[PDB]
Amino acid sequence: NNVTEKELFYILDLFEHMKVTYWLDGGWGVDVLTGKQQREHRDIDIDFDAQHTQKVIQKLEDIGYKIEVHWMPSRMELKHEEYGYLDIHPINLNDDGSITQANPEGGNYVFQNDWFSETNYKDRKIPCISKEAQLLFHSGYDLTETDHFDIKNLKSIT
Amino acid sequence: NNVTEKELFYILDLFEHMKVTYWLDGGWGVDVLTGKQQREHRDIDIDFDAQHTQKVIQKLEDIGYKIEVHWMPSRMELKHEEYGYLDIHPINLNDDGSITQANPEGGNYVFQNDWFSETNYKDRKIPCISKEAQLLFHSGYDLTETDHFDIKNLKSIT
Ligand SMILES: CCC[C@@H]1C[C@@H](C(=O)N[C@@H]([C@H]2O[C@H](SC)[C@H](O)[C@@H](O)[C@H]2O)[C@@H](C)O)N(C)C1
Ligand SMILES: CCC[C@@H]1C[C@@H](C(=O)N[C@@H]([C@H]2O[C@H](SC)[C@H](O)[C@@H](O)[C@H]2O)[C@@H](C)O)N(C)C1
Ligand SMILES: [Cl-]
Ligand SMILES: [Mg+2]
Ligand SMILES: [Mg+2]
Ligand SMILES: [Mg+2]
Ligand SMILES: [Mg+2]
């Protein structure tokens, strides 16, 4: 049921084939920063260009993902019988160079651009959020045992 | 108004003369990691060995700090007419090797040992929380402009 490296690569291929700018986030994002798989994963988190929201959802449905949680335009969780869980997060990629997310209520989060980057993982280049961003969006007073493991793995990155 | 480097050192000295294990935290903790002062600070945050809570409070009171809000177990917020604001956070250095802080809603927060570090600041060794711990206890979705400034100062750390 867990999301294997091969299944992650397939999802990465989907977005790249669709020419949708995106970055891997969450737990697989942590492992990718370390250069190898560290643990089993329930899910993949992908942050993606919000202008392609409709065709991203449609393609995921087309290959068998079922929508289970729809918190859009903030977040959506889908589930595939083989590929596992996938959470997508639409983000706004503005012509003025800025990268934003709508504030669930009022306003816009303005991300730091260098929080979105790329790493060479087993000689594939994978766009992903940075180690710094991973630590920033983790919450120190709200950590699971698995969060603790991931944070230690980030620390081991030279 | 603020808390100067000289004032900071004197508060650090109090803990050292009391022989209480402690770590500098908060904004001054960020500056110390970088090795020089970066901005004016309204307060000091110090995490310290909870076994010494009673004598630590007594000494702060003896030199003239007044308790503003008593939030045990999390912390005590204090204020001094000349030295300004000081928050202290009692942490438990357990014989099982864990480091924890009580959570008023049940259980405890678990910290990692390597979040408690030190650095050479102007040829003084100051114990302080780590760079990664500072990022971790910041909240990505709730950063002020000063938080961003503080965080970028940690980038610059070669
Ligand atoms: C540099 C930008 C990083 C941002 C962080 C990411 C995000 O929102 N993650 C959520 C996650 O909450 C839970 S994990 C605890 C969810 O399980 C997970 O799917 C996911 O939503 C939370 C940690 O902030 N954002 C879109 C972009
Ligand atoms: C390493 C584990 C120890 C815990 C971590 C620490 C913590 O939360 N510090 C925050 C502080 O952010 C602001 S200061 C800039 C807050 O004002 C301050 O209260 C304070 O939370 C960190 C970002 O500097 N805790 C009390 C104990
Ligand atoms: Cl630990
Ligand atoms: Mg994930
Ligand atoms: Mg997730
Ligand atoms: Mg502070
Ligand atoms: Mg503070």
From Swiss-Prot, chains A, B:
GO BP of this protein: response to antibiotic
Pfam family, one: Aminoglyc_resit
Keywords: Antibiotic resistance
Disulfide bridge map: none
Entry superkingdom: Bacteria
InterPro entries noted in UniProt: Aminoglyc_AdlTrfase, NT_sf
NCBIfam families recorded: linco_LnuA
Protein name from the UniProt record: Lincosamide resistance protein
UniProt lineage: Bacteria, Bacillati, Bacillota, Bacilli, Bacillales
Gene: linA
